[PDB]
Structures are given as structure tokens and as C-alpha cells.
Design a protein around this motif. Structure first.
Motif, PDB file in Angstrom:
ATOM      1  N   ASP A 240     -10.806 -12.096  -5.403  1.00 56.08           N
ATOM      2  CA  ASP A 240     -12.059 -12.757  -5.722  1.00 56.08           C
ATOM      3  C   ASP A 240     -12.319 -12.575  -7.220  1.00 56.08           C
ATOM      4  O   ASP A 240     -11.518 -11.970  -7.938  1.00 56.08           O
ATOM      5  N   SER A 241     -13.453 -13.096  -7.715  1.00 55.98           N
ATOM      6  CA  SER A 241     -13.793 -12.935  -9.124  1.00 55.98           C
ATOM      7  C   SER A 241     -13.975 -11.470  -9.496  1.00 55.98           C
ATOM      8  O   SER A 241     -13.535 -11.042 -10.570  1.00 55.98           O
ATOM      9  N   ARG A 242     -14.621 -10.688  -8.629  1.00 53.57           N
ATOM     10  CA  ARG A 242     -14.822  -9.269  -8.907  1.00 53.57           C
ATOM     11  C   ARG A 242     -13.494  -8.519  -8.940  1.00 53.57           C
ATOM     12  O   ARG A 242     -13.273  -7.657  -9.798  1.00 53.57           O
ATOM     13  N   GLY A 243     -12.599  -8.832  -8.013  1.00 52.02           N
ATOM     14  CA  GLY A 243     -11.327  -8.142  -7.963  1.00 52.02           C
ATOM     15  C   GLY A 243     -10.463  -8.660  -6.837  1.00 52.02           C
ATOM     16  O   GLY A 243     -10.759  -9.684  -6.219  1.00 52.02           O
ATOM     17  N   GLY A 244      -9.375  -7.929  -6.577  1.00 52.96           N
ATOM     18  CA  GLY A 244      -8.434  -8.281  -5.539  1.00 52.96           C
ATOM     19  C   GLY A 244      -7.968  -7.058  -4.761  1.00 52.96           C
ATOM     20  O   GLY A 244      -8.152  -5.910  -5.182  1.00 52.96           O
ATOM     21  N   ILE A 245      -7.359  -7.327  -3.606  1.00 49.76           N
ATOM     22  CA  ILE A 245      -6.851  -6.287  -2.723  1.00 49.76           C
ATOM     23  C   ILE A 245      -5.408  -6.607  -2.360  1.00 49.76           C
ATOM     24  O   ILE A 245      -4.963  -7.754  -2.424  1.00 49.76           O
ATOM     25  N   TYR A 246      -4.674  -5.565  -1.974  1.00 45.50           N
ATOM     26  CA  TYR A 246      -3.269  -5.693  -1.618  1.00 45.50           C
ATOM     27  C   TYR A 246      -2.962  -4.803  -0.423  1.00 45.50           C
ATOM     28  O   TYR A 246      -3.475  -3.686  -0.323  1.00 45.50           O
ATOM     29  N   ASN A 247      -2.125  -5.309   0.480  1.00 40.31           N
ATOM     30  CA  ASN A 247      -1.698  -4.555   1.652  1.00 40.31           C
ATOM     31  C   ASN A 247      -0.321  -5.034   2.091  1.00 40.31           C
ATOM     32  O   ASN A 247      -0.179  -6.172   2.556  1.00 40.31           O
ATOM     33  N   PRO A 248       0.717  -4.204   1.950  1.00 36.18           N
ATOM     34  CA  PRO A 248       2.063  -4.620   2.380  1.00 36.18           C
ATOM     35  C   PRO A 248       2.155  -4.979   3.852  1.00 36.18           C
ATOM     36  O   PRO A 248       2.925  -5.885   4.199  1.00 36.18           O
ATOM     37  N   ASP A 249       1.404  -4.311   4.723  1.00 39.51           N
ATOM     38  CA  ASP A 249       1.432  -4.588   6.152  1.00 39.51           C
ATOM     39  C   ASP A 249       0.713  -5.877   6.521  1.00 39.51           C
ATOM     40  O   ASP A 249       0.908  -6.383   7.630  1.00 39.51           O
ATOM     41  N   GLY A 250      -0.104  -6.422   5.624  1.00 36.95           N
ATOM     42  CA  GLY A 250      -0.787  -7.672   5.889  1.00 36.95           C
ATOM     43  C   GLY A 250      -2.284  -7.533   6.064  1.00 36.95           C
ATOM     44  O   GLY A 250      -2.773  -6.496   6.520  1.00 36.95           O
ATOM     45  N   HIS A 263     -20.585  -7.888   2.010  1.00 33.66           N
ATOM     46  CA  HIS A 263     -20.735  -7.074   0.811  1.00 33.66           C
ATOM     47  C   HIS A 263     -20.712  -7.876  -0.485  1.00 33.66           C
ATOM     48  O   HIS A 263     -20.895  -7.290  -1.557  1.00 33.66           O
ATOM     49  N   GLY A 264     -20.488  -9.186  -0.422  1.00 38.65           N
ATOM     50  CA  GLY A 264     -20.470 -10.012  -1.610  1.00 38.65           C
ATOM     51  C   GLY A 264     -19.148 -10.066  -2.343  1.00 38.65           C
ATOM     52  O   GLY A 264     -19.028 -10.828  -3.311  1.00 38.65           O
ATOM     53  N   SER A 265     -18.145  -9.285  -1.904  1.00 39.76           N
ATOM     54  CA  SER A 265     -16.845  -9.282  -2.559  1.00 39.76           C
ATOM     55  C   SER A 265     -15.807  -8.734  -1.593  1.00 39.76           C
ATOM     56  O   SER A 265     -16.138  -8.103  -0.587  1.00 39.76           O
ATOM     57  N   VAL A 266     -14.544  -8.989  -1.934  1.00 43.40           N
ATOM     58  CA  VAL A 266     -13.455  -8.504  -1.096  1.00 43.40           C
ATOM     59  C   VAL A 266     -13.010  -7.108  -1.502  1.00 43.40           C
ATOM     60  O   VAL A 266     -12.080  -6.560  -0.900  1.00 43.40           O
ATOM     61  N   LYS A 267     -13.649  -6.500  -2.497  1.00 40.55           N
ATOM     62  CA  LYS A 267     -13.237  -5.191  -2.985  1.00 40.55           C
ATOM     63  C   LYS A 267     -13.497  -4.114  -1.939  1.00 40.55           C
ATOM     64  O   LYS A 267     -14.360  -4.263  -1.070  1.00 40.55           O
ATOM     65  N   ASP A 268     -12.733  -3.042  -2.039  1.00 41.08           N
ATOM     66  CA  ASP A 268     -12.830  -1.868  -1.175  1.00 41.08           C
ATOM     67  C   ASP A 268     -12.618  -2.189   0.299  1.00 41.08           C
ATOM     68  O   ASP A 268     -13.246  -1.556   1.156  1.00 41.08           O
ATOM     69  N   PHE A 269     -11.753  -3.145   0.621  1.00 42.99           N
ATOM     70  CA  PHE A 269     -11.445  -3.463   2.005  1.00 42.99           C
ATOM     71  C   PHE A 269     -10.752  -2.274   2.670  1.00 42.99           C
ATOM     72  O   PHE A 269      -9.912  -1.620   2.032  1.00 42.99           O
ATOM     73  N   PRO A 270     -11.078  -1.956   3.927  1.00 44.60           N
ATOM     74  CA  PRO A 270     -10.437  -0.811   4.591  1.00 44.60           C
ATOM     75  C   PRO A 270      -8.931  -0.970   4.714  1.00 44.60           C
ATOM     76  O   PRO A 270      -8.443  -1.987   5.216  1.00 44.60           O
ATOM     77  N   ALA A 272      -6.839  -1.346   2.293  1.00 45.13           N
ATOM     78  CA  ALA A 272      -6.304  -2.192   1.238  1.00 45.13           C
ATOM     79  C   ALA A 272      -6.546  -1.555  -0.124  1.00 45.13           C
ATOM     80  O   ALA A 272      -7.620  -1.004  -0.382  1.00 45.13           O
ATOM     81  N   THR A 273      -5.541  -1.635  -0.991  1.00 47.11           N
ATOM     82  CA  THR A 273      -5.636  -1.076  -2.333  1.00 47.11           C
ATOM     83  C   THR A 273      -6.240  -2.110  -3.276  1.00 47.11           C
ATOM     84  O   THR A 273      -5.756  -3.243  -3.355  1.00 47.11           O
ATOM     85  N   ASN A 274      -7.295  -1.721  -3.991  1.00 51.02           N
ATOM     86  CA  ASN A 274      -7.939  -2.622  -4.936  1.00 51.02           C
ATOM     87  C   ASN A 274      -7.026  -2.852  -6.135  1.00 51.02           C
ATOM     88  O   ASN A 274      -6.529  -1.895  -6.738  1.00 51.02           O
ATOM     89  N   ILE A 275      -6.803  -4.119  -6.479  1.00 44.25           N
ATOM     90  CA  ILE A 275      -5.946  -4.496  -7.593  1.00 44.25           C
ATOM     91  C   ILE A 275      -6.645  -5.575  -8.413  1.00 44.25           C
ATOM     92  O   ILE A 275      -7.566  -6.246  -7.949  1.00 44.25           O
ATOM     93  N   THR A 276      -6.191  -5.730  -9.652  1.00 40.50           N
ATOM     94  CA  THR A 276      -6.711  -6.742 -10.554  1.00 40.50           C
ATOM     95  C   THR A 276      -5.925  -8.043 -10.378  1.00 40.50           C
ATOM     96  O   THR A 276      -4.787  -8.052  -9.902  1.00 40.50           O
TER      97      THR A 276
END
Length: 415
Positions: A240-250, A263-270, A272-276
Motif C-alpha cells: 500500500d502507500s504506507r508500506g508493504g508486506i511479504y510472506n514466502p508461504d503466501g 486499520h487503514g493499511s496493510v502494515k503489520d499483518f500477522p 508477514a514481514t513489513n517491507i518497503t
């Protein structure tokens, strides 16, 4: 200047094809530009006048098509460039349409619902003489929605006195009044079909592969979701504009959308690692689908792209120099106006349904979109292989060739 960029792109496209000089000069100028004043009555009782545009670039192939923008930064040059760009967009998917575009210089956030309805009705009253079911079909665009589309259709029907298919004068209408099924997922469905065709061309089986989507709006979320079920791919990164998330398992697109909505953003998803966004665009995946702010692939990150397929869902997210760099790397790019051509195709389907008086189902709309996207992509890819040019250039050549043939058939140009 937007119109200058559009003209330069048209000249670059003509460089790769045999087109007469008179046809190029004809295509470099919109065939009709209409600028009108749009007077509305404000809620305080005063009368305000707005500037409205309606540019019809070309109509050799049929009635012009294009949305209406309600933006405070609207200019005549921008509308002309977008109409010029709509022409090739409808030409690449073999629609019987021309190029059109509208716009009003207004800030809709400062207008109430009644004022917005008055603005739409006054715009229709101003541009009635140059629009129609078989002349010019507007559509939703930035800061415009199906509600405004329905208001515009109602005003057009009132003026026309119900002497014809007033439903077909405008697309993107609500389902209750001449609406069409499958409009919400049109762009994502077209992007998924083009991705599947690209994988078929490259010999890659998408079942179990990885996709990263840059941008999680409407088109981005539906693209990720569509891919996940239909294509069987594993969504490993969304942003998203605030940030991004990554997860190898999907990632589960539905859960990610729900968390973003909460929460208004996809950041800090359970889990999932927060990435730019910058390293997300550089992830080791097979399909990359930028569905966000344009110009995300430039000199800095062009060499670091590891995706096998780049599906340009957004409007021109890759610069021409980055285009050349990725082409040298063997990465297949789906052109921006070919990948997201599902929306205009579904608008054409809605226009056909309105004109005919008979409405289709979700499956039929989805079976027809599949055929259209598959044929357009395969034509563009065949031009790519035959002419040994960039895909983008192949799509431009196909669109300009179709428009040029239509112009020659009408007798507009003698060469």
C-alpha cells in the motif's frame, strides 16, 4: 505538456510502421474539441460557472469512448492526451470505438451531493449536442462514480424525450438502471487473462508460482485475489502507500483486505514481514503487477527486477528507458494499455447490452472478456515476434494500424 507527450509517443509508434504522412498529421490532431461553461446553483443560492471539456480524438472505427474526470487540476491538454490514449486503448482490443475524454475543472470534495448532481446534469445539458449512444459514450473516471453516471444518464434521457436507447449513452451505470455485471472486477480479470496468456506464451505453468502486487486498491486487490484462486499462484507480497508486506508461504487476499479496512493499511499483518515498495518491486517472483502510482520502474531499480512477467496494471508504471532495460534482460512486459483494457471492454459490453435491450450474466460477460483479451494479447505478441520490437511498440503498431486502416476505408486519407 501531456498532449506533446502523446504526440511524441504517436510519432515513435509510427517510426516502427509504414504510415502515410497525411494520416499521421490527421492522427496528431483531435477531430473535435468542445469546451463549455457549466453553470450550477450552489447550496448558498449563488451561481458558479465551471469549465467542462469533451474531446473526441477520432471516430473512424465507431463512436468515441472515454471517461469524465472531476479534478481541480484538469486541463484541455490533459483531456486531449487522454482521448488520444483512449483511441489506442479501444483499438488494441478491436473494439468498434473511437477515442474520447471529458473533464470538469472542479474540486468535488468541496461539493455536496445536490451540487454534484446539479453539476452532472448541467454538464449533460452543455455537451448534449456532441454525445449520444452512437456518437460519444462517456464513462466513470477519477473522482466520478456510478451515481454520477446514473444522474447523467437520467438527464440525457430527459433531454432526449426517450426517443432511443438512452441507457446506452453512458457506461458505468448502477445495476438497477442499465448496469452490467462484472464491472467491478473488469480490470483485474483482464490483467489475469493477459498474465495467463503471457505464461502460456513463455511456457510457464502458473500453478504454484509466486506473484507480488504493488498497490492494494481496487484493481490491485482483485488482481491478487483473481490470481490466487483462478491461476493458482501464491500471493507472496502486497503493498500500500504506507508500506508493504511479504510472506514466502503466501498471503490470503481476503484477510489482508479486511485488515487494511480495519486499520487503514496493510502494515503489520500477522505473520508477514513489513517491507518497503522499493525492495518489493525487486523480489524474486514470476509475475509482478504494479497497480499503483505510476513510474515505479526507473534506472535505479530496472536492473534489479527479477520477475519473469511484468503486468502493467497501472497507467504506465515503467519508463521507456526501463522498458528497454527489461527487454534486454529477457523480461516480458504486458503493455499498460493492453493489460488494463478489461475495464473498457466491459464498458463496451455494457453498451452492447443497453443498445440491444438484452442483458447477459456474469459467466457470459466473463467468457467474452476472456476471448477479447486472449485475442488482443496474442495479436500484440505476434507483432512482437514478427517485428522484433518491444511489446509496447507492438501494441502501439497494432492500434495505429487498425485506426489507419479504418481511416483509409472511409476515404478520409487517400494514401
Amino acid at each position: 505538456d501531456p498532449f506533446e507527450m502523446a504526440v511524441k509517443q504517436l510519432e515513435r509508434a509510427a517510426q516502427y510502421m509504414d504510415i502515410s504522412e497525411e494520416a499521421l498529421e490527421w492522427l496528431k490532431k483531435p477531430m473535435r474539441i468542445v469546451e463549455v461553461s457549466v453553470p450550477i446553483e450552489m447550496d448558498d443560492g449563488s451561481v458558479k460557472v465551471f469549465t467542462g471539456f469533451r474531446v473526441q480524438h477520432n471516430w473512424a472505427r465507431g463512436p468515441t469512448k472515454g471517461g469524465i474526470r472531476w479534478h481541480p487540476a484538469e486541463t484541455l491538454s490533459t483531456v486531449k492526451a487522454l482521448a488520444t490514449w483512449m483511441t489506442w486503448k479501444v483499438a488494441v482490443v478491436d473494439l468498434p470505438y473511437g477515442g474520447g475524454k471529458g473533464g470538469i475543472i472542479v474540486n468535488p470534495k468541496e461539493l455536496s451531493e445536490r451540487e454534484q448532481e446539479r453539476l452532472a446534469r448541467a454538464y449533460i445539458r452543455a455537451v448534449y449536442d456532441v454525445i449520444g449512444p452512437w456518437t460519444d459514450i462517456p464513462a466513470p473516471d477519477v473522482y466520478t462514480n456510478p451515481k454520477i453516471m446514473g444522474w447523467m444518464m437520467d438527464e440525457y434521457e430527459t433531454i432526449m424525450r426517450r426517443k432511443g436507447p438512452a441507457f446506452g449513452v453512458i457506461t458505468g451505470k448502477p445495476l438497477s438502471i442499465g448496469g452490467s455485471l462484472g464491472r467491478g472486477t473488469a480490470t483485474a480479470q483482464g490483467a489475469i487473462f493477459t498474465i495467463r496468456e503471457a505464461a502460456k506464451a513463455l511456457g510457464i505453468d502458473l500453478k504454484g508460482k509466486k506473484i507480488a502486487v504493488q498497490g492494494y486498491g481496487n484493481a490491485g486487490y482483485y488482481t491478487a485475489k483473481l490470481a490466487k484462486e483462478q491461476l493458482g499462484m501464491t500471493v507472496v507480497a502486497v503493498s500500500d502507500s504506507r508500506g508493504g508486506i511479504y510472506n514466502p508461504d503466501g498471503l490470503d487476499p481476503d484477510e489482508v483486505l479486511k485488515w487494511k479496512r480495519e486499520h487503514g493499511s496493510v502494515k503489520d499483518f500477522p505473520g508477514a514481514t513489513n517491507i518497503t515498495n522499493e525492495e518489493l518491486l525487486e523480489l524474486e517472483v514470476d509475475v509482478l503487477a504494479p497497480a499503483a502510482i505510476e513510474e515505479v520502474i526507473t534506472e535505479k531499480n530496472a536492473d534489479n527486477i527479477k520477475a519473469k512477467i511484468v503486468a502493467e496494471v497501472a497507467n504506465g508504471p515503467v519508463t521507456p528507458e526501463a522498458d528497454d532495460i527489461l527487454r534486454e534482460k529477457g523480461i516480458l512486459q504486458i503493455p499498460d494499455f493492453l493489460c488494463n483494457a478489461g475495464g473498457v471492454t466491459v464498458s463496451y459490453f455494457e453498451w452492447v447490452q443497453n443498445i440491444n435491450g438484452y442483458y447477459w450474466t456474469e459467466e457470459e460477460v466473463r467468457e467474452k472478456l476472456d476471448k477479447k483479451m486472449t485475442k488482443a494479447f496474442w495479436e500484440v505478441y505476434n507483432t512482437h515476434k514478427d517485428k522484433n520490437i518491444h511489446m509496447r511498440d507492438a501494441a502501439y503498431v497494432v492500434a495505429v494500424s487498425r485506426v489507419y486502416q479504418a481511416m483509409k476505408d472511409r476515404g478520409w486519407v487517400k494514401k
